[PDB]
Amino acid sequence: KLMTGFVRASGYANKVRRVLFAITRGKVFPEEVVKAAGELNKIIFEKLQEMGVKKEDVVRISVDFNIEDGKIVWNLDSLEIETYKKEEEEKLALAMEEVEHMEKMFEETVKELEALSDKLREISKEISELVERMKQEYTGLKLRSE
Amino acid sequence: PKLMTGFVRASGYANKVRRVLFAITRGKVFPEEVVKAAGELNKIIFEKLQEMGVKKEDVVRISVDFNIEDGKIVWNLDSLEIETYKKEEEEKLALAMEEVEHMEKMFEETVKELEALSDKLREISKEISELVERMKQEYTGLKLRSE
Amino acid sequence: PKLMTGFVRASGYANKVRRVLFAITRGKVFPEEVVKAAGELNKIIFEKLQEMGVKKEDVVRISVDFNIEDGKIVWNLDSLEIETYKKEEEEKLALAMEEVEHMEKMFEETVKELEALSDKLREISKEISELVERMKQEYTGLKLRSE
Amino acid sequence: KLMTGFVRASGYANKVRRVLFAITRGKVFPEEVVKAAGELNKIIFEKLQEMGVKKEDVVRISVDFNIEDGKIVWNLDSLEIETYKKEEEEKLALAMEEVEHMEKMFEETVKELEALSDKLREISKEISELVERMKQEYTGLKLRSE
C-alpha cells in the first residue's frame, strides 16, 4: 500500500512519488516509478479539482498497487483521498506548510550535494583515464584494453 | 611517422615498443588497436632477435615507420631496423639499461598502488552518485535523471 | 534574532532547537558554541515541559530571542515561549508531527550512509595526495610541498 | 649507501634526492631529505666543477650516510664520483640523455595527476563540510563538534 500521511495538497504529487520510490526500491526501475506516479498524480489531481480542494488544504492519500513484471499496476478502486480544509484545521495546515517550506530549503542542500558529486564523478573519471594512460606509456602493466 | 625505442635492454623491448606506440598514436587510435599492432610487431621483432643471437642482457634500438589508416596501425616491415649492442662489447650501456629496467619494475609497484586507489575512488564516487540521486527521489521534488 | 521551531512533537523538541540554531547562526558562530548554547536552552525547556505536564506525544512550538556577542549565543530567557498542544485536543496535528518525526529517523539512516561514504572518500583522497607527493619525491625533480 | 647508478650529470642532483627519498622512506621527514640532499648536491657540484665535468657527461654517485635522531648525516669520506665523458662513452651518454628526456615528459603527467588530486582533495573537503552541515541542520545525529 502507498500512503502519503498528512501532506499539503500543493505538494501531494511529489510526496506520492517519494513514497513510491522508497517502497518499490530494488523492485522496480526509476523510470517506471516516475511513469507510475505521474499517472496516479494525474488521476489524483482530477479528483482534487472535483473535490474543491485548495492547495492550502491538507490531504492524505492511500492506494494499493501491485508490481507485475517490474511494472507498477495501480488499483484505482483502492484509492482513498482524505481531505482536511485549512479553515477547519488551521494548525495542521500551518504545520504542513511549514513542512513544505523546510523541504524547499533542504532541496537547495541536495542540489549543492549533487553538484559536488557530479564534480567528483568527473574528477574520478579523469583520474582513472590518466592512471590508465600512465600504465600505457610508462609501464609494462596489464592494460584494461588487453 | 616513426616508432623509436631508443636504447633498451632486449629483455624489455616489447613493453618499450608498446609504450612508445601508445604515446605517439595518442588520440589517433583506440588502445585495443595499439595493443594489437604492438603485439604483432613484437612477435616479428622477437623472431629476428632470436635469429640474430641476441641475449636479453644485450641492448637494442628499434625503429620502424608505420601509418595510421582508418584508425588502424599498418606497419611498414621494410623500414624496421634493429640495432644491437652486445653486453660484452658495451658493458656500461648494458649496465645502465639493466638499471633502467629495474627502476621501472619498482615504479610499477607505485602505479599499481595508484590504480588500486583510483579504483576505490571510482567505486566510492559511483556510490555517492547513487545515494545522492536516491535522496533526490525520496526526499525532494527535484528533477530526476530518470525523467 | 529569534529562534522558532514551528510545530514539533515534544519528544523531538531538543533536536529541532539545535537544528534551527545551527541554520540561523551559520557562519556567525562555531558549531561547539551552537551545541553548547542549545544544550543549555534544551535543559531549561525540558524542565518547563516537565512542570507543564507535557507528554512526548504532545506538540509544542518554541520561540526564543537570543543575541550573538563575541561569537557566543546569549539566550534571553525572558523571551522564551512554549506553546503546547495536547494530543487529545489535537489528534491530527499530533499524528502529523509523529509522522514527521518518523520520516526524520529514516532520513538519518540515509545521512549516516552518506557520512560513511564521505569518510571513505576523505581517506582515499588523503591517500592519493600522499602517494602523488611521494611520486614527486621519488620520480621527479618537481618542487615539493616540503620545500 | 646511496647510489644513483648511471645518470647524466645535468640531472645528478634530482637523482640524488630521488634515491634518498626512496631509501629513507618512513625513517625521515621529507624536509630533512630535501635538506640533506641539498647539502650533498652542493658538495657534489663543486667537485663536478673541479673535475671538468660537463652536463653531457655521465656520472655515478655513491655515498654512505647514517640516520641519527631522524637526521641524515653524510660521510663525505665515502663519497665516490665516477665520471664518464660523452666523447669516450657516446652510447651511454646518448642513453642517459634519452632517460633524462623521458623523465621531463613523465613530469608533465605527474603534474596533471597532482592537479587532479588537488581538485579531489578540495571536493572531498567540501563534501565532508556539507555532510556535517546536514547533520547539524537536518538531524539529531552525534556531531563532530560534540
TrEMBL record, chains A, D:
Residues 85-137 form a coiled coil. It comes from Pyrococcus furiosus (strain ATCC 43587 / DSM 3638 / JCM 8422 / Vc1). InterPro entries: ThermoDBP-RPs_arc. The keyword Coiled coil applies. Keywords: Coiled coil. It holds the Pfam family ThermoDBP-RP_arch. This is DUF2258 domain-containing protein.
